[PDB]
Design a protein around this ligand. Structure first.
Ligand SMILES: Nc1ncnc2c1ncn2[C@@H]1O[C@H](COP(=O)(O)OP(=O)(O)O)[C@@H](O)[C@H]1O
Ligand SMILES: [Cl-]
Ligand SMILES: [Cl-]
Ligand SMILES: [K+]
Ligand SMILES: [K+]
Ligand SMILES: [Mg+2]
Length: 378
């Protein structure tokens, strides 16, 4: 091709390419190394990635996201029925198969989850092509270790529809391990723990690797725990603050809340590198600007319980894998949320000081490994 590796994430997607013994994580048109798994429909155009997420606050009903939560599933599934209650866009039943329904160019249209995902993949494909200056066809796409045959098939279909020849569908934790060269043959078997906290899901996977062969020993986590939940805690904190300072409740103004969420998300990222962050929103509500700040300590307290709770699935995974902490040879951080210092501290403390593999941006680790594997398969 060269072939590329793509992490089609629940909230963010990332594409990499292995060239000259090195993996290049490819930045998009806006210079971002990861791209929102968002697609929006308007009276005149279809928006994808950054362009789509950048307008989610004003077009909530026609901006689709979380397509990965529906992919390969049946409409009657309990989880699908539960999730629908939280999404601002409509999900309809087409012969027992879920489809997202939106308005596009003034007409009602519906798309299968794989179609929405094919759009995101098309964007990743184009991002790679812009960088390489060549047509990209072959790719390795990743999926959660718990995905079944249907979910895997639908994900592969998303690739095909996007014009990609999916060389193989591999597990996200395995891709992360490959990124660190943990697939290399060293004689005896090794136990690796993948701690993956993204924007919407938390996955803990214990892999046993021997002779380059991976075995998923156990998996644990929470499909409804991620960075967005941390943003939410910050959002509530600031709604209360605005209310005290202006005796005005912004809760019912959907756009105001979404804009505050965006400001919180960015402030949160800054708190991973600094101990304080500034929030400066213009015309948040009724023309009132909201300029304030938040400390890392404050951010940690607001999420104390959620952070600490990530250790329960780690213990469960170890138990199911029938392994004690000391039997874990490597701990790999995956997901943008693992960049939070308090999380790293909790995990390291739990593992009695053991160092964490975190040199590769956690939110790029899966695509990194996928790119390596893609090169191998080509
Ligand atoms: N520096 C950072 N500090 C804290 N959270 C971050 C940072 N960078 C990204 N994130 C969070 O990571 C989450 C996205 O995770 P990512 O692994 O990129 O995607 P996905 O959720 O699709 O797997 C978002 O909640 C985002 O706010
Ligand atoms: Cl782009
Ligand atoms: Cl602590
Ligand atoms: K991702
Ligand atoms: K995850
Ligand atoms: Mg992820």
């Amino acid at each position: 091709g060269p072939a590329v590796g793509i992490d089609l994430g629940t909230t963010y997607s990332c594409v990499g390419v292995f060239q000259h013994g090195k993996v290049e994580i490819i930045a998009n048109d806006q210079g971002n190394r990861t791209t929102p798994s968002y697609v929006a429909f308007t009276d005149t155009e279809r928006l994808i990635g950054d362009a789509a997420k950048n307008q989610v606050a004003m077009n909530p009903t026609n901006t689709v996201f979380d397509a990965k939560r529906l992919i390969g599933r049946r409409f009657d599934d309990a989880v699908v029925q539960s999730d629908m209650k939280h999404w601002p866009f409509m999900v309809v039943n087409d012969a027992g198969r879920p489809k997202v329904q939106v308005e596009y160019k003034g007409e009602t249209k519906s798309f299968y989850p794989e179609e929405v995902s094919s759009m995101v993949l098309t964007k990743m494909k184009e991002i790679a092509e812009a960088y390489l200056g060549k047509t990209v066809t072959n790719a390795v796409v990743t999926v959660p270790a718990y995905f079944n045959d249907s979910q895997r098939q639908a994900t592969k279909d998303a690739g095909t529809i996007a014009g990609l020849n999916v060389l193989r569908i591999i597990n996200e934790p395995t891709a992360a391990a490959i990124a660190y060269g943990l697939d290399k043959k060293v004689g005896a078997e090794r136990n690796v723990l993948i701690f993956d906290l993204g924007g919407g899901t938390f996955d803990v996977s214990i892999l046993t690797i021997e002779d380059g062969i991976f075995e998923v020993k156990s998996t644990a986590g929470d499909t409804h725990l991620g960075g967005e939940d941390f943003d939410n805690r910050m959002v509530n904190h600031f709604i209360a603050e605005f209310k005290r300072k202006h005796k005005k409740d912004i809760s019912e103004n959907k756009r105001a809340v979404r804009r505050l969420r965006t400001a919180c998300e960015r402030a949160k990222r800054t708190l991973s590198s600094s101990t304080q962050a500034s929030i400066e929103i213009d015309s948040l509500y009724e023309g009132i600007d909201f300029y304030t700040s938040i400390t890392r300590a404050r951010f940690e307290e607001l999420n104390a319980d959620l952070f600490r709770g990530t250790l329960d699935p780690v213990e469960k995974a170890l138990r199911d894998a029938k392994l004690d902490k000391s039997q874990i040879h490597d701990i790999v951080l995956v997901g943008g949320s693992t960049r939070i210092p308090k999380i790293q501290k909790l995990l390291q403390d739990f593992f009695n000081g053991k160092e964490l593999n975190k040199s590769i941006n956690p939110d790029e680790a899966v695509a990194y490994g996928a790119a390596v594997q893609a090169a191998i398969l080509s």
